[PDB]
């Protein structure tokens, strides 16, 4: 988005820290081109005198202003996608009770017991549990108060800027391209999923190419369902975005909120409002307090769903801005935030769609970086969706999500202290699809030290997961 003012005022929100990711026995064997993100601007592994603060907020290239005709076109696409969205999800999007906002309904998970509470609770030294009874289902003093100022449109807040402690490619580590989380006040998170909770729960339960959303999916079992759908089509695309979150223009954001979350579709009048507050945000980064117009905080509730909805409207917007009489059945797509797989029997030129995405402020490149030219003919077994490649299993005949061996080496090479064993179990579920031999090599440094699930114990489990009959029939 557009940074309207940089200001150093009063307080200093300490976000500087050391990584708790420690190298494992795997790191010495594999030596990945991967390492923990730079969480302090004085990291020795940083490139020549490059300031970490400088790069972090440099994603804000501005707020792209759309013309009255581009706005009217985006509105039509937003109304058309929302028509499809609410036709298959229903209009049971009534406000979620204080209880259901905490505990979560069927589809929507419970709110996190104790994560970062946001502001001004961090400038007070207290937890999520010190504000809300997560065991009960209701809140505390200031939260039921904040509930009512949100109810009365009065509420104003500030986003707390966190540093993402994660493994990243060493090039991005050296460049200091550490990703950031914008932790919003816990009452905002609570009230957002009060307004759009049942909708988000419906989104998860109905995930698939029909709604154009992979949010709520189980890649272990849903890869078979997704893989067969996209195999039918002539051309498949692997689209890539440059800072997808920060580049959502205020015009596109406001219109989407106006068209999808209408009171006509069963939403509370404050469903449109609470999401509109995400347009113009205040960011607390240590001594700095920066106001940002446009883009969306990467860490709010339903952040993956909002970006999915936007990604769906973008593709429809761009195609209609180029081709004649483009409808929703002209193509098919599934998206998770910025991750996206497009398919059509038509030979669509995505090399020509570049500037039509630039009218939104988004830059589309092919994920397959080769010559960076959107080529035709690509199949389902070419794309990378959710870091997972689509592969036909030679044993059962079903699609399986395979991660690149270099990526799986990176996950295993770094882990927080005293978590190795549980992470080895968790990553083993991801690594089982790479084959019996690769599974052996990936876990070779861990033998005699930790419990490694036998390749067969995870394969036989996976077969029962994809189809309950598939294991019984064999």
């Amino acid at each position: 988005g557009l940074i309207v003012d940089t200001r150093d005022v009063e307080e200093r929100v300490h976000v500087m820290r050391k990584t708790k990711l420690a190298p494992t026995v795997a790191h010495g064997v594999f030596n990945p081109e991967f390492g923990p993100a730079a969480l302090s601007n004085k990291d020795p592994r940083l490139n020549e005198g490059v300031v970490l603060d400088e790069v972090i907020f440099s994603k804000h290239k501005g707020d792209t202003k759309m013309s009255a005709e581009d706005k009217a076109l985006f509105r039509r696409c937003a109304a058309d996608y929302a028509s499809r969205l609410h036709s298959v999800l229903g209009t049971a999007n009534a406000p979620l009770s204080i209880y259901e906002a905490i505990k979560g309904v069927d589809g929507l998970d419970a709110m996190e017991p104790d994560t970062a509470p946001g502001l001004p609770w961090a400038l007070q030294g207290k937890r999520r549990g010190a504000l809300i009874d997560f065991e009960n289902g209701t809140v505390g003093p200031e939260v039921e108060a904040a509930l009512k100022l949100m109810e009365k449109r009065e509420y104003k807040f500030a986003c707390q800027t966190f540093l993402k402690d994660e493994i990243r490619p060493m090039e991005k580590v050296r460049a200091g391209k550490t990703r950031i989380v914008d932790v919003l006040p816990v009452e905002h998170i609570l009230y957002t999923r009060m307004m759009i909770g049942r909708f988000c729960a419906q989104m998860h339960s109905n995930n698939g190419p029909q709604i154009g959303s992979a949010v709520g999916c189980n890649p272990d079992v849903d890869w078979q369902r997704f893989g067969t759908h996209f195999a039918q089509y002539r051309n498949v695309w692997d689209v890539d975005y440059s800072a997808f979150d920060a580049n959502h223009c205020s015009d596109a954001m406001n219109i989407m909120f106006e068209e999808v979350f209408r009171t006509e579709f069963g939403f509370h009048p404050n469903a449109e409002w609470i999401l509109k507050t995400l347009v113009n945000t205040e960011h607390a980064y240590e001594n700095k307090r920066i106001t940002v117009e446009g883009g969306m905080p990467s860490g709010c509730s339903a952040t993956s769903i909002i970006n999915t909805i936007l990604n769906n409207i973008y593709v429809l917007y761009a195609l209609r801005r180029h081709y004649e009489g483009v409808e929703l059945d002209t193509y098919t797509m599934i998206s998770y935030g910025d991750d996206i797989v497009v398919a059509s029997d038509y030979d669509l030129d995505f090399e020509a769609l570049k500037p039509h995405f630039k009218s939104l402020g988004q830059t589309i490149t092919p994920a397959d970086k080769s010559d960076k030219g959107f080529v035709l003919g690509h199949s389902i077994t070419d794309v990378t969706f959710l870091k997972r490649h689509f592969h036909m299993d030679y044993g059962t005949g079903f699609y399986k999500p395979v991660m690149a061996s270099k990526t799986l080496e990176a996950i295993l090479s770094f882990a927080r202290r005293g978590t190795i064993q549980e992470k080895l179990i968790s990553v083993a579920g991801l690594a089982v699809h790479s084959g019996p031999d690769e599974y052996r090599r990936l876990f070779e440094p861990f033998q005699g030290l930790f419990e490694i699930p036998s390749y067969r114990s995870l394969y036989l489990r996976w077969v029962n997961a994809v189809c309950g009959d598939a294991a019984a029939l064999e």
Binding site: D109, P169, P219, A367, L386
Partner: peptide
């Protein structure tokens, strides 16, 4: 590779 990184996130967590 642009901003799109190879190893970071799958999903949010388990359903």
């Amino acid at each position: 590779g642009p901003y799109a990184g190879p190893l970071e996130r799958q999903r949010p967590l388990k359903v």
